[PDB]
Design a protein around this nucleic acid. Structure first.
Length: 287
DNA sequence: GCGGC
DNA sequence: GCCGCAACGCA
C-alpha cells in the first residue's frame, strides 16, 4: 500500500524562481504517466538537493534500509561491490522521489529481467540506444541540430527511429528503441561506430573522443553512455540547475526552429496536455 | 531528508 | 550535532 507524506511543502529548492517542494511534487505527479514507461524496470540513480540547488547535492544509488517497503528494487554487481537500487514504476514512486528532493533521476539503457524460475531480477539487454550530443565552447545550434539530424539519418539507414530530448542542461540526448535488443556491450560498439562514421563526414563539426582538448567549436557525440555501467538523466527528469529545467522530449520540427531552448517544468506540463508523450514509441514494451 | 551515531 | 549518502574508464 503505497503512501508518501510531503514535508516542507513550501521549502524553496530553486531560489531563483521560488520553485518549492510542493511544485516539484506536483510536477512529478503531472508527468508520472508519460515518464514511468521510460524508467520502468530500470535501476534508479538519484541526485539529491535536500537544501536546494544553491546547496551541496549528492548522488545516491543504494536504497536506504528505511525507504518504504513497497518500492520495488533489484541488485546490481559491479567492479568492486554490490548495489541495491530502487526501481521507480508507479506514480507514488515519483512522489517518494520528490519528497526525497531527488530533483534528478538517472537510468541506464537496460532493464532488469526476471530469472526463468521465480523472479530474480538481473540486468537484461539494452532496449534502446542513447547518444549525448554535447556542444563545445561556442558551438552554434545550427551545428547541434545538424549533427542530430546526421545521427538520425545514419540510424535510419539501419532501420532505427530516433527521438530527440533536450537534456535540460546543455546537452541534447537522442534515443533509439532497438527492435532487436542486444547486450549493452554490443550496443556500445554499435553506438561507437555511428559516432565515428559521423566524425568522418564532418570532422570540423563532430568529435567522438571525449578529451576536452578537442572540444571547442565542435559537437561531441558521446556514445559511451550505452555502457551497461553508465547512466543517463531520465526523460522528463528535472535538472538541479538554477532554473527548474527538464530533460524534455522534442519533435524534429522543433529542432528546425532556430529558437530552440531548454524547457522549464511547467512548459513540459502543458506540452503533455497538448501532445501527450512524444516518446510513446520509445518504451512501448515497458513493465 | 533522514537514520546511525 | 555530525556525517554519509556513487564509482566510469583512465583523466
Amino acid at each position: 500500500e503505497q503512501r508518501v507524506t510531503l514535508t516542507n511543502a513550501d521549502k524553496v529548492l530553486y531560489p531563483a524562481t521560488g520553485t518549492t517542494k510542493s511544485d516539484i511534487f506536483d510536477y512529478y505527479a503531472g508527468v508520472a504517466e508519460v515518464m514511468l514507461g521510460h524508467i520502468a524496470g530500470r535501476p534508479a540513480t538519484r541526485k539529491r538537493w535536500p537544501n536546494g540547488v544553491d546547496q551541496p547535492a549528492f548522488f545516491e544509488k543504494q536504497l536506504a534500509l528505511s525507504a518504504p517497503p513497497w518500492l520495488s528494487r533489484a541488485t546490481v554487481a559491479h567492479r568492486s561491490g554490490t548495489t541495491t537500487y530502487p526501481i521507480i514504476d508507479s506514480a507514488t514512486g515519483l512522489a517518494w522521489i520528490a519528497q526525497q528532493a531527488a530533483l534528478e533521476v538517472h537510468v541506464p539503457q537496460w532493464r532488469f529481467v526476471a530469472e526463468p524460475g521465480s523472479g530474480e531480477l538481473n540486468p537484461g539487454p539494452a532496449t534502446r540506444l542513447v547518444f549525448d550530443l554535447d556542444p563545445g565552447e561556442g558551438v552554434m545550434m545550427a551545428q547541434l541540430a545538424e549533427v542530430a539530424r546526421a545521427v538520425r539519418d545514419l540510424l535510419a539507414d539501419i532501420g532505427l527511429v530516433t527521438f530527440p530530448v533536450t537534456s535540460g542542461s546543455k546537452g541534447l540526448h537522442l534515443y533509439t528503441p532497438l527492435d532487436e535488443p542486444v547486450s549493452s556491450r554490443g550496443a556500445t560498439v554499435l553506438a561507437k561506430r555511428v559516432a565515428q562514421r559521423l566524425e568522418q563526414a564532418m570532422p570540423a563539426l563532430v568529435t567522438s573522443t571525449m578529451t576536452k582538448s578537442l572540444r571547442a567549436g565542435k559537437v561531441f557525440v558521446d556514445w559511451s553512455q550505452n555502457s551497461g555501467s553508465k547512466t543517463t538523466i531520465a526523460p522528463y527528469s528535472l535538472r538541479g540547475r538554477t532554473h527548474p529545467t527538464v530533460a524534455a522530449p522534442r519533435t524534429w520540427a522543433e529542432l528546425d526552429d532556430p529558437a530552440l531552448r531548454q524547457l522549464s517544468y511547467d512548459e513540459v506540463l502543458t506540452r503533455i496536455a497538448r501532445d501527450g508523450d512524444l516518446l510513446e514509441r520509445l518504451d512501448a514494451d515497458a513493465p
